[PDB]
Structure 1
């Protein structure tokens, strides 16, 4: 396409701390990728992020009803939606499927778990391994599921242990040849 693009972007963000003890709400407008105005619940008013947002900042601020709604957002928008999603998002817990296989390099694949918080450890003869271990990091599969790969450079029982919120105890997969 020859035609140039013009994108407008708006993000209403809700940041939660300690459950919903603290909540912080943002109303951000982006020209292309550059934010020009924002409402921060901690500021209580629209602030021009760049000079482009000045007209909007001043204009929106002169609206008692708009400000009232945004100032109420932390409770009516954020805490409300957190309540509606709470059970299937905040509470979602899917257990990981662990698989150990040789690539001597040993690979421990931990797949399909939610949330992302996980602990994957390699043990050789019941003793942990720090050196020689490589991780791929958290990988979001884009479907409320994560995957992680942990490789161990091997020179004997090799156990890949996984700690995840969805489990009462660690997942161990012991491998030999």
Structure 2
């Protein structure tokens, strides 16, 4: 996907007495901001998490988010009845901006209710999602009247975010722009049947994310290769398993080949042996 910074929110409304919110900020898959709910302050997980922003601007953004989180739960409790919400329910939000090929930075904001699309932002206006139903159309026609909320959202999406994204991309280039070589190893999985075997190729520790793994008979791509999911390690690296359902003896002179940008053209090749 295109490079993107965004903050997210998860809000749980258990009863009209109780609610809870979780927040964080992200470069794509990599978390760079936490949020201390219990003290209403931001948590910077990288030395460059403030970007090129001043401690003045950061404190201003921190105060807007603190007021928003404080206010958001109360305003939902307040309007719950008029929206005919039954507890418990939950809400999620993501807002940010992404750098697209061609230089143009595109901002976005999306909200969900019960894990289902509820609204999104376009042309700096509220746009109800068909899945959000009557409540979504009621919400967008309502929020449009609070011009201060609309003003702040409009500024943060279109003024602050594009600046902050470029700032932070550069500020963290030492971590963001690096090549980490994977290690790879072979193993045998749970046999699919009798005589049959499952050849397993692990690839771990690569950065950045794109990667290519296939089971090989010499230069022939075994089209039966099943590719698992790319899974995270803690140290900003990834993990991937490629497996192949094969009959015994058919797994003779089979190799696992790994292409990755950090390998300088020297693919890892592991022969079953």
- Shorter chain as denominator, the TM-score bin is 0.7 to 0.9
1:94 paired residue among 166, 174, 180:
180
Q: What does 1:153-164 correspond to in 2, within 5 Å?
A: 153-154=246-247, 155=250, 156-164=252-260
CA deviation vs aligned residue, 1:81-135 (integer Å, no higher than 9, x gap): 333344423x2432211102233332111112222211112222x2323243222
Name the structure 2 match of 1:116.
Answer: 209
CA deviation vs aligned residue, 1:11-52 (integer Å, no higher than 9, x gap): 22222223x712111234445545655444xx1x22242221
Name the structure 1 match of 2:140.
Answer: 53
- Equivalent residue pairs, number: 169
**C-alpha distance in structure 1 between counterparts of 2:272 and 2:230, whole Å:** 23
CA contact (8 A) 1:23 1:74 kept: no
CA contact (8 A) 2:97 2:157 kept: no
2:167 paired residue among 75, 80, 84:
80
- 2:116 aligned with 1:23: no
Name the structure 2 match of 1:139.
Answer: 231
TM, length-normalised to structure 1: 0.74
Evaluate the alpha carbon distance shift between residue 7 and residue 82 of structure 1 in structure 2; reply closer, same or farther with a 3 A threshold: farther
CA contact (8 A) 2:206 2:238 kept: yes
SS in 1 for 2:169: helix
CA contact (8 A) 2:216 2:222 kept: no
Alignment gaps of 5+ in structure 2? 1-13, 16-86, 129-135, 190-196
Name the structure 2 match of 1:12.
Answer: 95
TM, length-normalised to structure 2: 0.51
**C-alpha distance in structure 1 between counterparts of 2:155 and 2:228, whole Å:** 46
Using the TM superposition, give the Cα deviation of residue 145 of structure 1 relative to its aligned residue in structure 2, in angstroms.
2.4
CA RMSD, Structure 1 to Structure 2 (Å): 3.1
Using the TM superposition, give the Cα deviation of residue 8 of structure 1 relative to its aligned residue in structure 2, in angstroms.
4.6
Using the TM superposition, give the Cα deviation of residue 68 of structure 1 relative to its aligned residue in structure 2, in angstroms.
4.3
Alignment gaps of 5+ in structure 1? none
Higher share of residues assigned helix: 2
Using the TM superposition, give the Cα deviation of residue 64 of structure 1 relative to its aligned residue in structure 2, in angstroms.
5.6
2:200 paired residue among 80, 101, 107:
107
